[PDB]
Amino acid sequence: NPEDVAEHLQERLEKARHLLLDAGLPEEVVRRATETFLQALKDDPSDRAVQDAVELVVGLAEAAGLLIDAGIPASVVLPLVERLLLGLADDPSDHRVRDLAELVVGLAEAAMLARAVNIPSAVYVPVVEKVLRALLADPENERARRAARRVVELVLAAARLLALGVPPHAVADAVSLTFRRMLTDPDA
Amino acid sequence: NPEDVAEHLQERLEKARHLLLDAGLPEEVVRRATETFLQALKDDPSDRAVQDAVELVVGLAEAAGLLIDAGIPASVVLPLVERLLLGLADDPSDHRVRDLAELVVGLAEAAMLARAVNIPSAVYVPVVEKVLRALLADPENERARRAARRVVELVLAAARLLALGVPPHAVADAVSLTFRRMLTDPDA
Amino acid sequence: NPEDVAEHLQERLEKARHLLLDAGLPEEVVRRATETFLQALKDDPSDRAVQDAVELVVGLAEAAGLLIDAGIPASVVLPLVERLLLGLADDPSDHRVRDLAELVVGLAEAAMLARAVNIPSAVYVPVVEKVLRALLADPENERARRAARRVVELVLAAARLLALGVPPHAVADAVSLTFRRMLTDPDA
Amino acid sequence: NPEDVAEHLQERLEKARHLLLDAGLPEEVVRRATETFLQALKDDPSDRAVQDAVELVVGLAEAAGLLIDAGIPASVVLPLVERLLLGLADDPSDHRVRDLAELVVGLAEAAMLARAVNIPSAVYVPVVEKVLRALLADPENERARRAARRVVELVLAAARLLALGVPPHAVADAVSLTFRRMLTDPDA
Amino acid sequence: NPEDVAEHLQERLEKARHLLLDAGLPEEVVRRATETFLQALKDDPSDRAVQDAVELVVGLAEAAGLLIDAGIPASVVLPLVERLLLGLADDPSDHRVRDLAELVVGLAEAAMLARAVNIPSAVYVPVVEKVLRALLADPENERARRAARRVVELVLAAARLLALGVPPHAVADAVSLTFRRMLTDPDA
Amino acid sequence: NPEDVAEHLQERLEKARHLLLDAGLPEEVVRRATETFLQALKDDPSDRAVQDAVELVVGLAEAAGLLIDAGIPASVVLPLVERLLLGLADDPSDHRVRDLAELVVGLAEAAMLARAVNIPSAVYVPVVEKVLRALLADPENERARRAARRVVELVLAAARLLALGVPPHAVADAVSLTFRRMLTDPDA
Ligand SMILES: [Zn+2]
Ligand SMILES: [Zn+2]
Ligand SMILES: [Zn+2]
Ligand SMILES: [Zn+2]
Ligand SMILES: [Zn+2]
Ligand SMILES: [Zn+2]
Ligand SMILES: [Zn+2]
Ligand SMILES: [Zn+2]
Ligand SMILES: [Zn+2]
Ligand SMILES: [Zn+2]
Ligand SMILES: [Zn+2]
Ligand SMILES: [Zn+2]
């Protein structure tokens, strides 16, 4: 129910504020964004756009911590998460900002799944770092968005290869070669 | 349960709309097809044909994005996906249309798996482009369907070679040679 | 778990029925065999012989399509698959019938892998055609079974040569010479 | 309601005292912490920090038992839980102590979920043992906290792989390889 | 209120006597235990130990019926419940006896919840049978108590995996694998 | 993981039993060896010697079939495989028996690769027949072991010549001459 989802999203928003504060974001930005989203939920709980924006905010709060723990420096994750949070707070129905937020959440999920499929950190951390740096440079750059989507597709293809019956070692070797090639060649 | 599957398919159908809207398809066609399928699910949730058609529609929605990201131009993917969507909307139990939709989804999956196997893009993108152009020319052409099925079988054979113990580099070399020959000669 | 494997096998059996109908088998034979196997699974899910027979049936359903797409005429594949399906349906624990079914599945897998190894179709399709014709002539002929097993071993030896470090072109040339000689001389 | 939550937390605190006594902690420490927290709840039921501290105390009481049952020796779990209990009792609003308690509760949950995922005990018990030993050595060590968070993320990624459609056996194999590498190298 | 709890426990004790008589326990033992507990409640209603013992007795009365219906033979449940009832009647404040009674009640609840999460009976009934046989052999055996606690934790981890978003089929498959391994290997 | 390897080796041992029964070995010997090895795996899964012996047994099970298909009579292969199986079953850590089993598996692999290299059967079958007859005569004869190792090295040198760039026909001619010389003179 829209009111029930609103209450659950307020709880998850408090948790997201805690996670963002622990990650390293400034207190003022987190406070402003969380207050704006909480007020938006309180005034119109039935609003779908606010609910989707809050879901994306919680996803980003988790993703920032996952990406910082993975190895990507906090000098490229924190500014990107700050800009995404501000953009979501301003216009909760700005399509490009939501697309970028889901791109970052998918990148964090792919980075956490590449470890599970036993891909070394030294081959996949550089690629995610490059993609995040390119996204931080110009948010509207289509090539960086394509690269992020291709990294997610590579991790999903590794999962599909595992499902097909290939031993985990062969899958890890092949996808590590693919990541090494993607480090230099864009269309690889 | 048929009603539970209907609800899950409604959610996946909404997600498939966005992705189709994101890909570049016209808004009117996507709206028409999605509304028709949602109404079909709502009236008769237990209908198996509608459920299979919705599954194929979601698969095509993901496949269009994967194929466009791979490198195949949107001038050959979008018309084909539009035709398949319209055919599925009209008759959700037209066997040839479902076969073609499954062929396109399998081609997208094969193109995504060829990257994980570390096959260069310049040798497999032309082959998928040619196959999709032949399919767009005449949907009932048996040679194009056979070529698509053979591409999928080649990717699966590369996976089987990886499982047999061949190093990934040798597998990539052999399958790249096979793709190069398939570019020129049909039965290659 | 035997019941879980049984349920998965019913799903794969429906898929196998679809594939066999697509291949060109008569509807009546496919319906009879599939209903018999489904009933056998439902009555005694824990039965190992029924599960093995259903696995062989799914393998044969895939193998028929692979062999028809490869180039072998449907006048030698469809009768053989029909006879194997009927034999499996009658006695799911007839050792010779299961051996022949695994021989056909292995022949299809070898034909699929010879393309990845980059062996031309014109050298390996005639040999598989001859082996399948000999098998269709007399199922109990030991020479035809030996020839099928030797074709599978030749493709596996090509994979082993690829693994040893021989370049793919040299492997293709040597195994093509071997296939050319196997066309004429039996112990080649 | 704050008073209702206070009553429920008093009941759970009695249960947690029983669990801690059964685990092997000294009677005096458990008694001291429990009476301090009960008095804090009684004087100011509406206090949020006391409620969060009591929730963490109950979580730790269950976590100690789960970790001891899993195989981790009581010589590394009991001192850590004792220190965490004393720290929570002293300052119920010390951010680092709550973070460490949440890390230990998450480690216990990950250890209990790795068994359900069907991960062998000999590959994950050593890693949790090493992480807990590092945490007991220096509580403020960031590397140990990062390692605990990475173990939790690995278990969650295994769950995500199960949700994607990979068979449980392949998931177990891949995540077991990841655990084996994490045993030796820190960023694995 | 202690007197109100005493009255409610007298009613539940009559119900528990009915359930124990239905299960198959001898009339004399049930009569003796119920009369002793009823007299203890009547003389000192405010006594906490008697109330806890009566609660455990009602739990055991339900647990015996649940375990017998589950499939575990009455030759291993009835002697264990008889010994537990006699021990509770003799000293209602014997810590080990209450711990064993709670272990049996938790085992019954785990066996009841394993069916809800769709785990086949043939994989979990043998494990509970083995645990109960080991407990009947030597009540003070720590390995059997650890095994019972681990079975309860496995069912709770299955519930947590359901809560995380894994489909019920994958959860059932993974926990069934875990149960099959627990059948042989004690630390599985 | 040792338990995972034990389970995989149990499955491969069942497959090896099937292959050995198909080859022509007596049922009693195959059953005895297989049950002994299965029990050894079950009691101590972590044992390395048992795992190596099971791997050698599977290799021998495949090698017997390959050698019989190649043309070598079953009167010299089946007794040798029987003796090797019994020796491995008795002491799974007897160095000489493992060396002889590895020699036979290598001879089968060399005979399989000599066909791919396109060496006629009439020049290499007699040499393998003579080597296997000498090995069956006296297992500890060093000359027969040296001859088997030299056959394997000749096939590997043919593969190396193919890798160097020599045309396959010249390689086949040179190695056929070498095999003809080896037929008569021992150090040829
Ligand atoms: Zn709610
Ligand atoms: Zn549902
Ligand atoms: Zn979008
Ligand atoms: Zn299942
Ligand atoms: Zn079809
Ligand atoms: Zn209440
Ligand atoms: Zn914190
Ligand atoms: Zn009352
Ligand atoms: Zn009754
Ligand atoms: Zn206790
Ligand atoms: Zn495994
Ligand atoms: Zn057989």
Short mmCIF file of N, CA, C and O in Angstrom, two decimals, chain C residues 78-166:
data_model
loop_
_atom_site.label_atom_id
_atom_site.label_comp_id
_atom_site.label_asym_id
_atom_site.label_seq_id
_atom_site.Cartn_x
_atom_site.Cartn_y
_atom_site.Cartn_z
N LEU C 78 15.63 -38.10 -38.78
CA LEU C 78 14.29 -38.27 -38.21
C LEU C 78 13.90 -39.74 -38.00
O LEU C 78 13.38 -40.04 -36.92
N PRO C 79 14.10 -40.66 -38.95
CA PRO C 79 13.80 -42.07 -38.64
C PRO C 79 14.61 -42.62 -37.47
O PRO C 79 14.08 -43.36 -36.64
N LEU C 80 15.89 -42.25 -37.39
CA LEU C 80 16.73 -42.75 -36.31
C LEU C 80 16.26 -42.23 -34.96
O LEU C 80 16.17 -42.99 -33.99
N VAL C 81 15.94 -40.93 -34.88
CA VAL C 81 15.45 -40.37 -33.63
C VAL C 81 14.09 -40.95 -33.27
O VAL C 81 13.81 -41.19 -32.09
N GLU C 82 13.24 -41.20 -34.27
CA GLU C 82 11.95 -41.83 -34.00
C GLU C 82 12.13 -43.22 -33.40
O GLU C 82 11.49 -43.57 -32.41
N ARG C 83 13.01 -44.02 -34.00
CA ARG C 83 13.25 -45.37 -33.48
C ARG C 83 13.84 -45.32 -32.08
O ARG C 83 13.44 -46.11 -31.21
N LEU C 84 14.78 -44.41 -31.83
CA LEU C 84 15.37 -44.30 -30.50
C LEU C 84 14.33 -43.87 -29.47
O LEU C 84 14.30 -44.39 -28.35
N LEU C 85 13.46 -42.92 -29.84
CA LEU C 85 12.42 -42.47 -28.93
C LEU C 85 11.46 -43.60 -28.59
O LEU C 85 11.09 -43.79 -27.43
N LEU C 86 11.04 -44.36 -29.61
CA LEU C 86 10.14 -45.48 -29.36
C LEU C 86 10.79 -46.54 -28.49
O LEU C 86 10.17 -47.08 -27.57
N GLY C 87 12.06 -46.85 -28.76
CA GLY C 87 12.76 -47.83 -27.95
C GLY C 87 12.92 -47.40 -26.50
O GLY C 87 12.76 -48.21 -25.59
N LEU C 88 13.23 -46.12 -26.28
CA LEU C 88 13.32 -45.62 -24.91
C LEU C 88 11.97 -45.64 -24.22
O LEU C 88 11.88 -45.94 -23.03
N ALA C 89 10.90 -45.29 -24.95
CA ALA C 89 9.57 -45.29 -24.36
C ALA C 89 9.14 -46.70 -23.96
O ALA C 89 8.57 -46.90 -22.88
N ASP C 90 9.39 -47.68 -24.82
CA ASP C 90 9.01 -49.06 -24.53
C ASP C 90 9.74 -49.59 -23.30
O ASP C 90 9.11 -49.91 -22.29
N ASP C 91 11.06 -49.70 -23.39
CA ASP C 91 11.88 -50.19 -22.28
C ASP C 91 12.89 -49.11 -21.89
O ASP C 91 13.92 -48.96 -22.56
N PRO C 92 12.64 -48.35 -20.82
CA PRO C 92 13.57 -47.27 -20.46
C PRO C 92 14.90 -47.77 -19.91
O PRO C 92 15.78 -46.97 -19.60
N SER C 93 15.05 -49.09 -19.79
CA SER C 93 16.26 -49.68 -19.22
C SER C 93 16.83 -50.73 -20.16
O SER C 93 17.38 -51.75 -19.72
N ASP C 94 16.72 -50.50 -21.46
CA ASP C 94 17.32 -51.38 -22.47
C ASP C 94 18.70 -50.81 -22.78
O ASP C 94 18.82 -49.73 -23.36
N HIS C 95 19.74 -51.55 -22.39
CA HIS C 95 21.10 -51.01 -22.39
C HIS C 95 21.55 -50.60 -23.78
O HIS C 95 22.18 -49.55 -23.96
N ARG C 96 21.25 -51.43 -24.79
CA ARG C 96 21.71 -51.14 -26.15
C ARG C 96 21.06 -49.87 -26.69
O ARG C 96 21.71 -49.08 -27.38
N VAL C 97 19.77 -49.67 -26.40
CA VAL C 97 19.09 -48.47 -26.87
C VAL C 97 19.69 -47.22 -26.24
O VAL C 97 19.91 -46.21 -26.93
N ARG C 98 19.97 -47.26 -24.94
CA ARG C 98 20.63 -46.12 -24.30
C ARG C 98 22.02 -45.88 -24.87
O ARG C 98 22.42 -44.73 -25.05
N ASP C 99 22.77 -46.95 -25.15
CA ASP C 99 24.09 -46.79 -25.75
C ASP C 99 23.99 -46.11 -27.11
O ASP C 99 24.77 -45.21 -27.42
N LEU C 100 23.01 -46.51 -27.93
CA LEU C 100 22.83 -45.88 -29.23
C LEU C 100 22.41 -44.42 -29.08
O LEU C 100 22.85 -43.56 -29.86
N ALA C 101 21.56 -44.12 -28.10
CA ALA C 101 21.14 -42.74 -27.89
C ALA C 101 22.31 -41.85 -27.48
O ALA C 101 22.46 -40.74 -27.99
N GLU C 102 23.15 -42.33 -26.56
CA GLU C 102 24.35 -41.58 -26.22
C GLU C 102 25.32 -41.47 -27.39
O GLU C 102 25.99 -40.44 -27.52
N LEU C 103 25.40 -42.49 -28.24
CA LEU C 103 26.20 -42.38 -29.45
C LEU C 103 25.72 -41.28 -30.37
O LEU C 103 26.54 -40.51 -30.88
N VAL C 104 24.41 -41.18 -30.59
CA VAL C 104 23.87 -40.10 -31.42
C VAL C 104 24.08 -38.73 -30.78
O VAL C 104 24.43 -37.77 -31.48
N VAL C 105 23.86 -38.61 -29.47
CA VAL C 105 24.09 -37.33 -28.80
C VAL C 105 25.56 -36.92 -28.89
O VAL C 105 25.87 -35.75 -29.15
N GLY C 106 26.48 -37.87 -28.68
CA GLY C 106 27.89 -37.59 -28.86
C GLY C 106 28.28 -37.23 -30.27
O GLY C 106 29.15 -36.38 -30.46
N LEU C 107 27.66 -37.87 -31.27
CA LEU C 107 27.89 -37.47 -32.65
C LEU C 107 27.44 -36.05 -32.92
O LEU C 107 28.14 -35.30 -33.61
N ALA C 108 26.28 -35.65 -32.39
CA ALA C 108 25.84 -34.27 -32.55
C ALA C 108 26.78 -33.29 -31.86
O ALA C 108 27.09 -32.23 -32.41
N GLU C 109 27.23 -33.62 -30.65
CA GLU C 109 28.18 -32.76 -29.96
C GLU C 109 29.51 -32.66 -30.70
O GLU C 109 30.10 -31.57 -30.77
N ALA C 110 29.99 -33.77 -31.27
CA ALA C 110 31.21 -33.75 -32.06
C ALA C 110 31.04 -32.91 -33.32
O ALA C 110 31.96 -32.17 -33.70
N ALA C 111 29.89 -33.01 -33.98
CA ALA C 111 29.63 -32.17 -35.14
C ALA C 111 29.56 -30.69 -34.77
O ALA C 111 30.02 -29.85 -35.55
N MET C 112 29.00 -30.37 -33.61
CA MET C 112 28.98 -28.99 -33.13
C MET C 112 30.36 -28.46 -32.77
O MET C 112 30.64 -27.29 -33.02
N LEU C 113 31.22 -29.30 -32.19
CA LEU C 113 32.56 -28.88 -31.80
C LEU C 113 33.54 -28.85 -32.96
O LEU C 113 34.52 -28.10 -32.90
N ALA C 114 33.32 -29.64 -34.01
CA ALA C 114 34.21 -29.61 -35.17
C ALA C 114 34.13 -28.27 -35.89
O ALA C 114 35.12 -27.84 -36.48
N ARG C 115 32.97 -27.62 -35.85
CA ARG C 115 32.85 -26.29 -36.44
C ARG C 115 33.65 -25.26 -35.64
O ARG C 115 34.31 -24.39 -36.23
N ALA C 116 33.60 -25.34 -34.31
CA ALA C 116 34.38 -24.43 -33.48
C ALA C 116 35.87 -24.62 -33.69
O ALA C 116 36.64 -23.66 -33.74
N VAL C 117 36.31 -25.88 -33.81
CA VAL C 117 37.69 -26.19 -34.15
C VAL C 117 38.06 -25.70 -35.55
O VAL C 117 39.24 -25.73 -35.92
N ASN C 118 37.08 -25.20 -36.30
CA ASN C 118 37.24 -24.65 -37.64
C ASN C 118 37.58 -25.73 -38.66
O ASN C 118 38.51 -25.57 -39.46
N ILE C 119 36.84 -26.82 -38.63
CA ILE C 119 36.92 -27.88 -39.64
C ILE C 119 35.84 -27.60 -40.68
O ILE C 119 34.69 -27.35 -40.31
N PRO C 120 36.16 -27.62 -41.97
CA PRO C 120 35.14 -27.33 -42.99
C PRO C 120 34.00 -28.32 -42.94
O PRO C 120 34.17 -29.49 -42.57
N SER C 121 32.81 -27.85 -43.30
CA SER C 121 31.63 -28.71 -43.30
C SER C 121 31.72 -29.83 -44.33
O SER C 121 31.21 -30.93 -44.08
N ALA C 122 32.38 -29.59 -45.46
CA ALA C 122 32.42 -30.55 -46.56
C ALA C 122 33.26 -31.78 -46.26
O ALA C 122 33.19 -32.75 -47.04
N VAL C 123 34.04 -31.79 -45.19
CA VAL C 123 34.86 -32.96 -44.88
C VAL C 123 34.24 -33.76 -43.74
O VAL C 123 34.35 -34.99 -43.72
N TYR C 124 33.57 -33.09 -42.81
CA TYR C 124 33.01 -33.78 -41.65
C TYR C 124 31.54 -34.15 -41.80
O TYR C 124 31.11 -35.12 -41.19
N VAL C 125 30.77 -33.40 -42.57
CA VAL C 125 29.36 -33.74 -42.79
C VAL C 125 29.22 -35.08 -43.51
O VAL C 125 28.38 -35.89 -43.10
N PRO C 126 29.99 -35.37 -44.57
CA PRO C 126 29.88 -36.70 -45.19
C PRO C 126 30.16 -37.86 -44.24
O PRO C 126 29.49 -38.89 -44.32
N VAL C 127 31.13 -37.71 -43.34
CA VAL C 127 31.46 -38.80 -42.43
C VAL C 127 30.33 -39.05 -41.45
O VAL C 127 29.95 -40.20 -41.19
N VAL C 128 29.77 -37.98 -40.88
CA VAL C 128 28.64 -38.13 -39.97
C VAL C 128 27.43 -38.70 -40.70
O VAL C 128 26.68 -39.51 -40.15
N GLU C 129 27.22 -38.28 -41.95
CA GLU C 129 26.14 -38.84 -42.75
C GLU C 129 26.32 -40.34 -42.95
O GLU C 129 25.36 -41.11 -42.81
N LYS C 130 27.53 -40.77 -43.28
CA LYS C 130 27.80 -42.20 -43.48
C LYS C 130 27.57 -42.97 -42.19
O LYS C 130 26.97 -44.05 -42.20
N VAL C 131 28.05 -42.43 -41.07
CA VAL C 131 27.90 -43.12 -39.79
C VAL C 131 26.43 -43.25 -39.42
O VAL C 131 25.97 -44.32 -38.99
N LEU C 132 25.66 -42.17 -39.59
CA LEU C 132 24.24 -42.22 -39.27
C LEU C 132 23.47 -43.14 -40.20
O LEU C 132 22.53 -43.81 -39.76
N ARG C 133 23.83 -43.18 -41.49
CA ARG C 133 23.19 -44.12 -42.40
C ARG C 133 23.48 -45.56 -42.01
O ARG C 133 22.58 -46.41 -42.03
N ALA C 134 24.73 -45.86 -41.64
CA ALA C 134 25.06 -47.21 -41.20
C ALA C 134 24.32 -47.57 -39.92
O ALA C 134 23.86 -48.71 -39.77
N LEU C 135 24.19 -46.62 -38.99
CA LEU C 135 23.42 -46.87 -37.77
C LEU C 135 21.94 -47.08 -38.05
O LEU C 135 21.32 -47.92 -37.40
N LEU C 136 21.37 -46.33 -39.00
CA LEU C 136 19.97 -46.51 -39.36
C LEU C 136 19.74 -47.85 -40.05
O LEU C 136 18.68 -48.46 -39.89
N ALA C 137 20.72 -48.32 -40.83
CA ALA C 137 20.58 -49.60 -41.51
C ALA C 137 20.42 -50.74 -40.51
O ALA C 137 19.39 -51.43 -40.50
N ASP C 138 21.42 -50.95 -39.67
CA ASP C 138 21.38 -52.00 -38.65
C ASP C 138 21.80 -51.40 -37.31
O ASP C 138 22.99 -51.07 -37.13
N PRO C 139 20.87 -51.25 -36.36
CA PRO C 139 21.24 -50.66 -35.06
C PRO C 139 22.28 -51.46 -34.30
O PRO C 139 23.08 -50.86 -33.56
N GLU C 140 22.31 -52.78 -34.44
CA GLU C 140 23.21 -53.64 -33.68
C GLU C 140 24.55 -53.84 -34.38
O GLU C 140 25.37 -54.63 -33.90
N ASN C 141 24.78 -53.16 -35.50
CA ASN C 141 26.06 -53.28 -36.20
C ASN C 141 27.16 -52.66 -35.35
O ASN C 141 27.12 -51.47 -35.03
N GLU C 142 28.15 -53.48 -34.97
CA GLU C 142 29.24 -53.00 -34.14
C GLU C 142 30.17 -52.05 -34.89
O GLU C 142 30.75 -51.15 -34.27
N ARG C 143 30.33 -52.23 -36.20
CA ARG C 143 31.23 -51.37 -36.96
C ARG C 143 30.73 -49.93 -36.99
O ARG C 143 31.52 -48.99 -36.89
N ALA C 144 29.41 -49.73 -37.13
CA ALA C 144 28.87 -48.38 -37.15
C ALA C 144 29.04 -47.70 -35.79
O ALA C 144 29.37 -46.51 -35.73
N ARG C 145 28.81 -48.44 -34.70
CA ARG C 145 29.03 -47.88 -33.37
C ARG C 145 30.50 -47.52 -33.17
O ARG C 145 30.82 -46.46 -32.60
N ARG C 146 31.40 -48.39 -33.63
CA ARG C 146 32.83 -48.09 -33.54
C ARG C 146 33.17 -46.84 -34.34
O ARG C 146 33.98 -46.02 -33.89
N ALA C 147 32.58 -46.68 -35.52
CA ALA C 147 32.85 -45.50 -36.34
C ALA C 147 32.35 -44.23 -35.66
O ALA C 147 33.03 -43.19 -35.70
N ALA C 148 31.16 -44.28 -35.06
CA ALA C 148 30.66 -43.12 -34.33
C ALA C 148 31.58 -42.75 -33.17
O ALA C 148 31.93 -41.58 -32.99
N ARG C 149 31.98 -43.75 -32.38
CA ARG C 149 32.90 -43.50 -31.28
C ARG C 149 34.23 -42.94 -31.76
O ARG C 149 34.79 -42.06 -31.11
N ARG C 150 34.73 -43.43 -32.90
CA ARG C 150 35.97 -42.91 -33.45
C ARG C 150 35.84 -41.48 -33.96
O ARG C 150 36.80 -40.71 -33.83
N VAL C 151 34.70 -41.10 -34.52
CA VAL C 151 34.49 -39.70 -34.90
C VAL C 151 34.52 -38.81 -33.66
O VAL C 151 35.15 -37.74 -33.66
N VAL C 152 33.84 -39.23 -32.60
CA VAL C 152 33.85 -38.45 -31.36
C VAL C 152 35.28 -38.33 -30.82
O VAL C 152 35.71 -37.24 -30.41
N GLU C 153 36.02 -39.44 -30.82
CA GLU C 153 37.41 -39.40 -30.38
C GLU C 153 38.28 -38.51 -31.25
O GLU C 153 39.21 -37.88 -30.74
N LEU C 154 38.02 -38.45 -32.56
CA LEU C 154 38.79 -37.56 -33.42
C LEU C 154 38.54 -36.10 -33.07
O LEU C 154 39.48 -35.30 -33.02
N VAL C 155 37.28 -35.73 -32.82
CA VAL C 155 37.02 -34.35 -32.43
C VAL C 155 37.67 -34.03 -31.07
O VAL C 155 38.24 -32.94 -30.88
N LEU C 156 37.60 -34.96 -30.12
CA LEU C 156 38.26 -34.75 -28.84
C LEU C 156 39.78 -34.66 -28.97
O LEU C 156 40.41 -33.89 -28.24
N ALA C 157 40.38 -35.43 -29.89
CA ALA C 157 41.81 -35.31 -30.14
C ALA C 157 42.16 -33.97 -30.77
O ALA C 157 43.23 -33.43 -30.50
N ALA C 158 41.28 -33.44 -31.62
CA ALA C 158 41.50 -32.09 -32.14
C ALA C 158 41.50 -31.07 -31.01
O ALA C 158 42.34 -30.16 -30.97
N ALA C 159 40.56 -31.20 -30.07
CA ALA C 159 40.55 -30.32 -28.90
C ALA C 159 41.83 -30.47 -28.08
O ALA C 159 42.39 -29.48 -27.60
N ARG C 160 42.30 -31.71 -27.90
CA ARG C 160 43.54 -31.94 -27.16
C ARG C 160 44.74 -31.31 -27.87
O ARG C 160 45.62 -30.75 -27.21
N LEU C 161 44.80 -31.41 -29.20
CA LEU C 161 45.88 -30.77 -29.95
C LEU C 161 45.83 -29.26 -29.81
O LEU C 161 46.87 -28.61 -29.73
N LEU C 162 44.62 -28.68 -29.80
CA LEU C 162 44.51 -27.25 -29.51
C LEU C 162 45.05 -26.92 -28.13
O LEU C 162 45.74 -25.92 -27.95
N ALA C 163 44.74 -27.77 -27.14
CA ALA C 163 45.23 -27.53 -25.79
C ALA C 163 46.75 -27.68 -25.68
O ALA C 163 47.37 -27.02 -24.84
N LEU C 164 47.36 -28.52 -26.52
CA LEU C 164 48.80 -28.73 -26.44
C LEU C 164 49.61 -27.54 -26.93
O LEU C 164 50.80 -27.45 -26.62
N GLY C 165 49.00 -26.63 -27.68
CA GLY C 165 49.70 -25.46 -28.19
C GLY C 165 49.85 -25.41 -29.70
O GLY C 165 50.48 -24.47 -30.21
N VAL C 166 49.30 -26.36 -30.44
CA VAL C 166 49.36 -26.31 -31.91
C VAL C 166 48.46 -25.19 -32.40
O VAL C 166 47.34 -25.03 -31.87
#
